[PDB]
Copies of this chain bind each other. A is one copy, B any other.
Amino acid sequence: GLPTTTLPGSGQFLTTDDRQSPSALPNYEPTPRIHIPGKVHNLLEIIQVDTLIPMNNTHTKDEVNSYLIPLNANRQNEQVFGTNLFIGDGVFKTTLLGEIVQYYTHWSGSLRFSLMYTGPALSSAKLILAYTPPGARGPQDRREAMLGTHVVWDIGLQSTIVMTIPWTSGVQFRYTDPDTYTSAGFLSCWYQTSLILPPETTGQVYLLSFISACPDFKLRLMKDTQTISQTVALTE
């Protein structure tokens, strides 16, 4: 008989501990694995695939239309859309990125925001996208917007433009749930010159917008998502 002493914590059950256990089914042989395409190893692998952002959130019931950012022909100087960058809330929240970020407490890294244009091929347009780093207000006019991170996008044969929100930060991690100290800025978009439709054409054209994370990205300290809850256990 070897002398032992038990410490504080004996008998506790910590849902996060990782130890060995007896197998209830001694000697059982599991089914062989066969090959299946698509294996995922890290959630970091999947948040780099871009998905659509319901940017046009202004509706009243969920609709395919809140994915469409409208553009008006012949407007000059004006603003196309605006949003803050609380990736865990608001427009971002239902996107795959938003949806995964919510399983973690802290995030750090660059984001990739792209816009794909869908107007007739014989039209043309020049837009400016601007990222405003924390510390200033959402820009109120392009002059204000153009003094921060921006890209003049020229609509052409190449249909999409990929803007990166480079990680601009004092503190090396931000909270995924919106927090002030930790806030990330604003994203706005304005006409640089203006949309022009060809003859025989009319109305609004739309941009689709996507979001995905750069390879830069870090997420840490897992927790429970506000995105799902329940009141009684389900049954069959």
Q: Are A3 and B14 within 8 A (Cβ)?
A: no
Among candidates B2, B23, B25, B32, residue contacting A5 with C-beta atoms closer than 8 Å: B2
Q: Are A11 and B14 within 8 A (Cβ)?
A: no
Q: Are A5 and B5 within 8 A (Cβ)?
A: no
Contacts of A6 in B (CB 8 A): 3-6, 10-11
A60 at the B interface (CB under 8 A): no
Q: How far is the CB of A174 from chain B (nearest CB, A)?
A: 12
A203 at the B interface (CB under 8 A): no
Which bracket fits the contact residues of A?
20 to 34
Q: Are A221 and B4 within 8 A (Cβ)?
A: no
Q: Are A29 and B172 within 8 A (Cβ)?
A: no
A220 at the B interface (CB under 8 A): yes
Main secondary structure of the interface of A (DSSP, over half): loop
Q: Which residue of chain B has the shortest Cβ distance to A221 in the bound complex?
A: B28
Contacts of A25 in B (CB 8 A): 16, 221-222
Q: How far is the CB of A42 from chain B (nearest CB, A)?
A: 12
Q: Which residue of chain B has the shortest Cβ distance to A5 in the bound complex?
A: B1
Contacts of A4 in B (CB 8 A): 1-7, 10
Q: Which of A31-89 contact B (CB under 8 A)?
A: 31-32
Contacts of A220 in B (CB 8 A): 28-29
Contacts of A23 in B (CB 8 A): 16
Q: How far is the CB of A179 from chain B (nearest CB, A)?
A: 16
Q: Are B32 and A172 within 8 A (Cβ)?
A: yes
Contacts of A8 in B (CB 8 A): 11-13
Contacts of A172 in B (CB 8 A): 31-32
Q: Which residue of chain B has the shortest Cβ distance to A106 in the bound complex?
A: B31
Q: Are A26 and B22 within 8 A (Cβ)?
A: no
A233 at the B interface (CB under 8 A): no
Contacts of A103 in B (CB 8 A): none
Of all A-B residue pairs in the complex, the 5 with the closest CB atoms, nearest first, are: A8-B13, A17-B22, A6-B10, A1-B5, A1-B3
